[PDB]
Design a protein around this ligand. Structure first.
Ligand SMILES: [Zn+2]
Ligand SMILES: [Zn+2]
Ligand SMILES: [Zn+2]
Ligand SMILES: [Zn+2]
Ligand SMILES: [Zn+2]
Length: 181
């Protein structure tokens, strides 16, 4: 199981809705939770482990044997709160890189569960923050897209280092460039 890193094009590719709720989905969900616990995360979207499908696994407590294991298939955020708050965000696709992002404080979410049944939930505080970040992955959106220009200045070099690393690894030109901003 492989964690994808920026600027890998998997992180910007279109993510397909899931229509069949079967054992392939069960097995992928188990593997995604296990990556999530191994990496000390509260949520994990599928493109981050290399699969372009609309799937997130989530434990608001982020601790084994605690909280709830939530699977969100084809999720939609139906409502964002008007109140916006700053927080220093990280991302598994950008190892060691953190910076301030402002997002709504709370959200309301519609999705389908592992058996295909509709449910909805509301999140606030750290869970709403992590949720929005991983949901953005599902739409091919990355956390520096949400950053102000001043915050982006502070990590531009760390990002260019990632772009040069992709070029070294593949021999292909970096598919996107932060200097375009
Ligand atoms: Zn397992
Ligand atoms: Zn597990
Ligand atoms: Zn922890
Ligand atoms: Zn991320
Ligand atoms: Zn430069």
């Amino acid at each position: 199981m492989e964690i994808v890193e920026y600027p890998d094009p998997i992180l910007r590719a279109k993510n397909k809705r899931i229509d069949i709720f079967d054992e392939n989905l069960k097995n992928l969900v188990d593997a995604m939770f296990d990556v999530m616990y191994k990496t000390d995360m509260i949520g994990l979207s599928a493109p981050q482990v290399g699969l372009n499908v609309q799937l997130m696994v989530f434990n608001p407590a982020g601790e084994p044997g605690e909280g709830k294991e939530i699977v969100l298939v084809n999720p939609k955020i139906k409502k964002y709160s008007d109140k916006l708050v700053p927080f220093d965000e990280g991302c598994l696709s950008f190892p060691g890189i953190y910076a301030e992002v402002v997002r709504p404080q709370s959200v309301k979410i519609d999705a389908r569960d592992i058996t295909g049944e509709r449910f909805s939930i509301s999140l606030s505080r750290l869970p709403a923050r992590i949720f929005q970040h991983e949901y953005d992955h599902l739409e091919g959106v990355l956390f520096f897209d949400r950053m102000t220009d001043q915050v982006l200045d502070s990590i531009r070099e760390e990002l260019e280092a990632l772009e040069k690393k992709y070029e070294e690894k593949t021999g292909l030109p970096s598919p996107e460039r932060v200097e375009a901003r």
